[PDB]
Symmetry: C5
Subunit: 232 residues, 5 copies
């Protein structure tokens, strides 16, 4: 049975699964193109893409066998991978800020509320819009604390590579992550049934941008910095 | 079809299965950032998560398929993994302590199993289980443990292995207690076991990793 | 559970190329330790191209044997994932030769996406077969154009030159087998299912394995030469 | 359904399967902890544990499914691994004596007689008692050749590591290997019926001792030498 | 159930499958015991045994389910692996002569005629005996070109290791490969198909020529790499 090109959510799942699998191999193998300062970052990136891979196989499974949005798998994957992205965030902060381990506590706290509220909405354990609002709070609390709350502590200019990582991190958590709540709105906040296709299409683009492309930017910083240190 | 959310135990199983997979990969890959002094410790850590992963697939499998607590899978998994944790201490008087810790661990698990499998009433089983566990902690003080291991990095490792067997390990008897010694609560029992395996196998290996990476970086830094 | 059907010529070809991508992937990933930092990402990308092909070859061949129909979607999804990856390789190479390298990447991607879009519309019956072929060649020739004339018309290293040529050579001579196969299938005025698949499978072998091999040969030579210091 | 605890043999296969899994990973991954002097040894060590894992999977399948002692799988496994262990013995002996090549041939001949006889017994192609004796002769001919025959050549303490590995080889053939004929006696040479439970339990233990544990001995010696030689 | 010991060839398939599995692992892992000169060699060797393994798994499936000879899996396996052994030969040849590229194309052409012929026979596409003679000609032409043709161009003392690898290559294509036609002869060239002998001989041939030949190269390479460091 060839892929059904009409099942475009079907195809999206397929594409992203391959993207996850590839990225995963790429992050692990390229660990040797970066130095000890950078290796653990690549491990975590690969680990994030890796877990998404397996969860993508299951997500696609259920879509195709039932045509229902795979909410529980979706959130289980976020539950597992969001904390690790937070760990990448922490790893970056620890290079340029005194408050890195305290921030990590609050960023984690943000993310759990963000995710729990989201899930409540989609699970029908809470009305959609209220749940969206609390979720948004969670996400925004993280942004707040990172740049305006406790995070305002240090913006150490010391390393061009660390500024890049820091820049990339901001970019991902602000515009990067914005794709998910966009997804949630499209699916649940237009006119009450669920617009299941557009929900999943957007979620799928968001995991690609946020798991694969973020990983990719960090690797590029990592390789560039690694190579300049070699020259010297 | 989609994962059934109302099955909290099923979900917990899923999550730790993934945690174990992830940790196993992480320990193996990260061996390249720790000196020869630490590599084997990371191997052993990866082995523990590895075995736990396979056993989590089956434990989960049983739960979804029948609703029964996978007691034998659980205990067999501990039987394979707990010895490897004790090995990690020997890697740190040594051969004597290992043998004593092993015996403790085996008395501990044996009694636990006895109770859960119905080969002994649960309370006496709990006491002998507790005795075995308690004997392990004892041997790390007045006993053969008062051999002040020369090496700060060795000490941070040892301290953290000291702490895990005391506070980390307590989650299991807590698990047993919840399930068998309250007013069987299979659901609560499996939730605490899951959490205990998660904390103890992942975080402990994370500790060793952390010490090892720090020690190794410092030692390559003094190579100037 | 029987022996491979010998009558089924298309099956044998799928089977073979499947194996070839499998071998190739292992080859490229393993051999990374025979090339320098300057070349390693190339080999990775090379390996990911063949690895992703491998998985899709497994599905393609299963679609063929179980139904006998042509695996258009699996075939195009495969190229959608691998072609940009091949363009990334051109970018990686071109990062030496010019400072305009990031521009070319953007343009070559757009060209190739058009090339595959046209082709797909053709085989999918979303657009008539012959005009689809035309827009197909447009994207392709546009790619070839921007490399030979236009922007890619720019320049300590005797290896980046061979790899450059390798690229210019393959995107012209190598990639040609694809529209050659499309013509064979849909442009004889039914659909020539077997010829199509045989040529595509042949093109994939040549362009994914043999291209990867050329880069490997350049990287290996350069790394052992630069080692003499 | 959960593992059945009353099926002792069943549990034994499960434990040993998993041990073979872990040890395979252990011996491969740990190769970067030993010098070029020892790597191939750890490779062969992981191969033996590796091949044994796959066979343990099948052996356990058979038992769980039929209750029959999985003879052919057992001896197929031994046929693939014993020659490898004999290869490891040759490598050690290479560092000790000039007679190393003929010893290897002699030992391979011994072990094949040994395994052939044992198998004929268990598969019912020969009486269980005489097969055992020929089995034992092959085994004993190996031991003889190491201790009194062409192997009385040179103990030659070239290295403290080579000397440790040599002695490890010398012990295992005797004390470690002895578990197998003991298991075979227990299963075929003591009763009315075949004592399959004991037989499988003892073989399981013997694979564990000889593949996993003996592999760890080579690993131990090899890590110590390599770390010492580096400084 | 337990493996069926009466099925000699069943068991034969089992034994070489596992040997291919082991040998693939051996060769990839052991690359860190040889220097850059030899690493690709070991990679090709692993690739040969790796392809063989996957094919042996299908070949055994076919022998159990049907009891028939898996002729197409076998030749498909050979079609993938022989070109690779020839690539290996070219790598050996390149350190010994300057006519290596010409030799590679010659030997490959030889080997495809060799395989196409044997297959045509076994598949029933061509009478069994003329097929044998033709396939045999392809082989012999390969042996012609190495000993008396373009191969007469040069030997090499440049290294005693390259000289060993050369010698092994010359030996293998003569005594090693000879096991294959012997098997065909056994199977199709006696009375009115001796399927067991054929398959036993071919499994033996794959073992000697893929696993054992591989081991010889590996050995040359570890000696040479170990001396090089000294
Ligand atoms: C790897 C996955 C990542 C980094 C996922 C991030 C997901 C979010 C930031 C989701 C956010 C949501 C809101 C901010 C509003 C309520 C529910 C959401 C979950 C979809
Ligand atoms: C990797 C798994 C580990 C380290 C498991 C450890 C389990 C224990 C320390 C359990 C202790 C128990 C008691 C002290 C009494 C009741 C039964 C218990 C076994 C689970
Ligand atoms: C790994 C796959 C690669 C590099 C595929 C390349 C495919 C092409 C260059 C296909 C080109 C086509 C045309 C130029 C005409 C219209 C449609 C085609 C797709 C088959
Ligand atoms: C990895 C497995 C190994 C090294 C197995 C060795 C098995 C033996 C040495 C068995 C010996 C036997 C006899 C000496 C008496 C006859 C029957 C036996 C085969 C089990
Ligand atoms: C890895 C497999 C290899 C190297 C196979 C080699 C096979 C041959 C040299 C077969 C030769 C045959 C003849 C020389 C006569 C014609 C029929 C044969 C194919 C089996």
């Amino acid at each position: 049975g060839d892929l059904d090109i009409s099942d475009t959510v079907g195809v999206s799942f397929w594409l992203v699964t391959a993207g996850m699998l590839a990225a995963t191999v790429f992050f692990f193998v390229e660990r040797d193109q970066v130095s000890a300062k950078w290796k653990t970052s690549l491990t975590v990136s690969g680990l994030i893409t890796g877990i998404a891979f397996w969860h993508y196989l299951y997500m696609r499974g259920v879509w195709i066998d039932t045509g229902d949005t795979p909410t529980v798998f979706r959130y289980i994957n976020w539950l597992l991978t969001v904390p690790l992205l937070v760990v990448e965030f922490y790893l970056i902060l620890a290079a340029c800020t005194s408050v890195a381990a305290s921030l990590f506590k609050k960023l984690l706290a943000g993310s759990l509320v963000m995710l729990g509220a989201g899930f409540a909405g989609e699970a029908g354990l809470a009305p959609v819009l209220p749940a969206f609002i609390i979720g948004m709070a969670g996400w925004l609390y993280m942004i707040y604390e990172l740049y305006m709350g406790e995070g305002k502590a240090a913006v150490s200019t010391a390393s061009p590579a660390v500024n890049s990582a820091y820049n990339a991190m901001m970019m991902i958590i602000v515009v990067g992550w914005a794709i998910y709540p966009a997804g949630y709105a499209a699916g649940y906040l237009m006119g009450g049934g669920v617009y299941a296709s557009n929900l999943n299409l957007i979620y799928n683009l968001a995991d690609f941008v946020n798991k694969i492309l973020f990983g990719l930017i960090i690797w590029n910083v990592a390789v560039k910095e690694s190579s300049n240190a070699k020259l010297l």
